[PDB]
Amino acid sequence: EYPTVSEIPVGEVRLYQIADGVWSHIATQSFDGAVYPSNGLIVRDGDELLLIDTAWGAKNTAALLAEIEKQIGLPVTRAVSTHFHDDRVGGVDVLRAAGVATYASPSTRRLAEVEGNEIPTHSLEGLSSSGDAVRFGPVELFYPGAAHSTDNLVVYVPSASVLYGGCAIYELSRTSAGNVADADLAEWPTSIERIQQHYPEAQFVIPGHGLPGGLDLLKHTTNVVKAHTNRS
Ligand SMILES: [Zn+2]
Ligand SMILES: [Zn+2]
Ligand SMILES: [Zn+2]
């Protein structure tokens, strides 16, 4: 029942209840002639909502807010972007305009700035060192070290045991490395091991793109990253 590019018109967003008061949001975007799905998270925070990641661009993100308004009807009060790339911060201006408080680590903010991307307003402290964790309302934010990017964060919902890996974690269908331009291939498996050692109880693992699964997505990503490292 998980939404594929099948039931998603490019420009539209679907929501998917993973567990009580946790959803993924799914959007699609064209790039280089192909169409890719993309996941974010929504976590209920008392009577408001915390959003993890934009829906990859201004139009998608305005559709995400409209689809939250239609289907959950609680205000989105804060948003966290898990790394600096456009698929996670693209739409930040739309969120801001709607009066959402936008957050990212200083590391993510610096990199977005250098990249010329949208820059979340508020800074998340105490995530600068590999293995650092901080509470952020109904989630824990965790910096595992460099992987898909040097600043990538993962999000864990302790109440539902949902680990949102962002783009640091690949779905099982992805059998080769994606865009790795900004990646730390050397540190990526070590970073995944930090995620493994910190959240062994995770029941649900949501990749940045594609189908949810269990903690074996971590091992899978390690396998794929290692094969790419060994290319010749
Ligand atoms: Zn990225
Ligand atoms: Zn503010
Ligand atoms: Zn991504």
Instruction: State the method.
Output: X-ray
83 in a known ligand binding site: yes
State how far Cα 87 lies from the chain centre. Answer: 9
Cα of 122 vs centre of ligand 2, distance in Å, is 6
Tokens describing residue 165:
């890996």
Name, in order, each residue with C-beta under 8 angstroms of 206's C-beta and a sequence gap of 6 or more: 18, 24, 39, 41, 162, 163, 164, 165, 169, 212
Q: Cα dist. 133→36, 114, 125, 136, 165 in Å?
A: 30, 25, 10, 10, 14
CA of 17 to the centre of ligand 2 (A): 28
Amino acid at the residue 138: P
Residue 120 and residue 26 in contact, taking contact as beta carbons nearer than 8 Å: no
Q: Is 122 annotated as a binding residue?
A: yes
Ligand showing the shortest atom-to-Cα distance for residue 182: 1
Q: Phi then psi for 20, rounded to 5 degrees? A: -65, 120
Residue 87 marked as a ligand binder: yes
For residues 57, 10, 83 and 115, what is the CA-based torsion angle, rounded to 10 degrees? -50
Residue 47 belongs to what H/E stretch?
A: none
Instruction: Extract the tokens encoding 216.
Output: 């074996």
CB–CB of 29/56 below 8 Å?
yes
Nearest listed ligand to the Cα of residue 147? 1
Q: Which residue has the tokens 């064209």?
A: 30
d(CA 132, CA 46): 25
User: Is residue 164 left, alpha or beta, with left meaning phi > 0 and alpha meaning psi from -120 to 50?
Assistant: beta
Ligand approaching nearest to the C-alpha of 206: 3
- Nearest-Å Rg of the Cα atoms of the chain is 16
Count Cα atoms within 13 angstroms, Cβ side, for 40: 30
Structure's resolution in angstroms: 1.9
198 among the known binding-site residues? no
Separation between Cα atoms, residue 144 and residue 128, nearest integer Å: 10
* Chain CA centroid to CA 222, Å: 18
Cα(218) to centroid of ligand 2, in Å?
34
The Cα angle at residue 33 between residues 109 and 55, in degrees rounded to 5: 35
Ligand 2 centroid–CA 79 distance in Å is: 11
Task: For residue 107, report the distance from its CA to the centre of ligand 1, in Å.
Answer: 14
Q: Are 52 and 88 in contact (CB under 8 A)?
A: no
b/e burial code for range 168-181 (CB count within 10 A of at least 16 → b): bbbbeebeebeeee
Task: Show which residues are catalytic.
Answer: 83, 85, 87, 148, 179
DSSP 77-100: EEEE-SSSSHHHHTTHHHHHHTTP
Q: Answer for the pair 140, 120: CB distance below 8 angstroms, yes or no.
A: no
